[PDB]
Each structure stands twice: as C-alpha cells, then as structure tokens.
C-alpha cells in the first residue's frame, strides 16, 4: 500500500495549499529576499502600517492593539483549519461531537505549528505577508505582552531547524487533528484508526522527502511534546490577561466573537 500512502500525502498537500493562503514556500521566499513587505519595528511604523497594511481589525493602547490583532487573525485561521480538516479522509464521517472536540483542542497546536512558517529569528510575517513585525519590537512590548510573543519565536527557531516543507506539514497538521487523546471524545477507535494512516503517510513522506535526515519522523513526533507544553503555558497567560487588563475590554459582540 505504498502507492496508497503517497496518494493520501498528495491529497492532503493539495487541500493544504487551497485552505491556507500563505504557504511556507511563499513565506520563505519573502523572508529571504527572493514586492518587498512593509516592516513594523517601532511605534511610528505601526501607526503608518495601519493606514497602509490596512489591517482588517482596527476598530488606544499599542500593546493591546497588537495582541487583539493576533486574536482576530487566529479566529480567521480556525475557520481555515476547519475547512482543511474536512478534507482528511474519514474526518467528516466521525460523530459530530467528536469532530467539534478534535477541532476545539487541536487548533491551538496547529496555529503555533503554522506560525513557525511565518517566522525567522528576526520577526514574523503578517497580513498574508505584506507586513513584518520584528522580534525586537515584539520582545520589548510592555506588561506581560512582551513575554507572550517571545516563546513562539524560541519554539519556531527550534522547530524550523527541522526544515519541513508544506507537503510535510500538511500531513503533520492532519496528525495533530486526529489525536485520540482529547478529553470528552465519544468514539476513540475511528480517530486512532485514521491517525495510523496519517502516521504511516507522514513516515513515508519524510523518508522520501528527507532521505538524509535520519529519524526525522521520530524527531517531529517529539515536537508534539513541545507544542502541548507551549499551548498550556499560553492558556495560563490568557487567564492573567483576562484578570489584569480591564483596558482589554471589548464591545460585547466583539468579546463574543473572540471568546475562542
């Protein structure tokens, strides 16, 4: 069934390109200077970026504005991921509650995984690659906002040293979604059955796409440990931001859209 695993890999890659506008291939071409993006490195260039990079989220404090900007984009990504999951063979046949449970607990790990595609050591692409926020500008943010963003850079630097491309990541993402260990799942067996195929598919993909990179399969799986740990730490930052930043108050309809 080797031919079958190559086929599943091809299916997921095609769906991945369609579901996610800014591919890792495209983002790397932009970061490496290969139509140049707008750069945000201080407060003034941010003010000129809102009226130039036309962020879809301007509705008075700067660090809050950035954090909520990250929140809005993440809510957009949850919809893109939801559309991608539907293409995973077997996903839409699962019990409806279980699909909702797999997406509820998986989007956070997928977002961080995919955010690494947009980062280098020096910053992160934004607005489908038209803007660029420097690591230094993010690390220097006041309050606990400065420490929210630096962990994602540290993880992305380690993670990106694996040198995965989009065809690799498309299967990795599918594998995260089909985690049979999410709390409250009603029928674990078909989820773990699908994950086995995706796991076979990822293993073959990495041997063929990285024949020199020994044990790349194992090493990528160990990155799920790091992902789970950073999602957990991130949650505890939200609780602190909710309970300390009353300036982080929103319009009730807005609070409601962004509560997840």
Ligand X SMILES: O=C(O)c1ccc(-c2nn(C(=O)c3c(Cl)cccc3C(F)(F)F)c3ccc(Cl)cc23)c(CNc2ccccc2)c1
Rounded Cα gap, residues 179 and 107, in angstroms: 12
Q: What does the per-residue mask of binding to ligand X show for 57-76, with x meaning CB under 6 A?
A: ------------xxx-xx--
CB-based burial label for 5 (10 Å; 0-12, 13-18, 19+):
buried
CB-based burial label for 51 (10 Å; 0-12, 13-18, 19+):
exposed
* Nearer of residues 44 and 222 to its own copies, judged by Cβ: 222
* Nearer of residues 69 and 106 to ligand X, judged by Cβ: 69
Report the partner that residue 203 touches, choosing among ligand X, its own copies, none (CB closer than 5 to 8 A by kind).
its own copies
Please give the DSSP secondary-structure letter assigned to residue 249.
Answer: -
Report the partner that residue 149 touches, choosing among its own copies, ligand X, none (CB closer than 5 to 8 A by kind).
ligand X
Taking contact as CB under 6 A, which single stretch among the options 29-37, 145-153, 196-204, 242-250 is the one that binds ligand X? Answer: 145-153
Does 207 engage in binding with its own copies (CB under 8 A)?
no
The CB-of-163 to ligand X minimum distance in angstroms stands at 20
Q: Are 131 and 41 contacting, i.e. CB atoms less than 8 angstroms apart?
A: no
Does 46 engage in binding with ligand X (CB under 6 A)?
no
Q: CA torsion sign, 184 to 187 to 190 to 193?
A: positive
Q: Are 58 and 244 contacting, i.e. CB atoms less than 8 angstroms apart?
A: no
H/E segment holding residue 126? strand 123-126
Please give the DSSP secondary-structure letter assigned to residue 123.
Answer: E
Residues near ligand X, by CB under 6 A: 69-71, 73-74, 77, 108, 111-112, 114-115, 124, 126-127, 138, 148-149, 152
Residues near its own copies, by CB under 8 A: 158, 179, 181, 195-196, 199-200, 203, 214-215, 217-219, 221-222, 224-226, 228-229, 232
Which residues are annotated binding-site positions for rosiglitazone?
A: 71-74, 108, 234, 258
């Amino acid at each position: 069934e080797s031919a079958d695993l190559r086929a599943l890999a091809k299916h997921l890659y095609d769906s991945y390109i369609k579901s996610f506008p800014l591919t890792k291939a495209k983002a790397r071409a932009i970061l490496t200077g290969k139509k140049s993006p707008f750069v945000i490195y201080d407060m003034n260039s941010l003010m000129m970026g809102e009226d130039k990079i036309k962020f879809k989220h301007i509705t008075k404090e700067v660090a809050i504005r950035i954090f909520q900007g990250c929140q809005f984009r993440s809510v957009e990504a949850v919809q893109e991921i939801t559309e991608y999951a539907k293409s995973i063979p077997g996903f839409v046949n699962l019990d409806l509650n279980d699909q909702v449970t797999l997406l509820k607990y998986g989007v956070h790990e997928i977002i961080y995984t995919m955010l690494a595609s947009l980062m280098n050591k020096d910053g992160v692409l934004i607005s489908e690659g038209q803007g660029f926020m420097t690591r230094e500008f993010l690390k220097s943010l006041r309050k606990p906002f400065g420490d929210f963003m630096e962990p994602k850079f540290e993880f992305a630097v380690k993670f990106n040293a694996l040198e995965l491309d989009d065809s690799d990541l498309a299967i990795f993402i599918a594998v995260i979604i089909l985690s049979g260990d999410r709390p409250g799942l009603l029928n674990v067996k078909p989820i773990e059955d699908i994950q086995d195929n995706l796991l076979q598919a990822l293993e073959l993909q990495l041997k063929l796409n990285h024949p020199e990179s020994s044990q790349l399969f194992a090493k990528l799986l160990q990155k799920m440990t790091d992902l789970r740990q950073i999602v957990t730490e991130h949650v505890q930052l939200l609780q602190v931001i909710k309970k300390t930043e009353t300036d982080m108050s929103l319009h009730p309809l807005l609070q409601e859209i962004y509560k997840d």
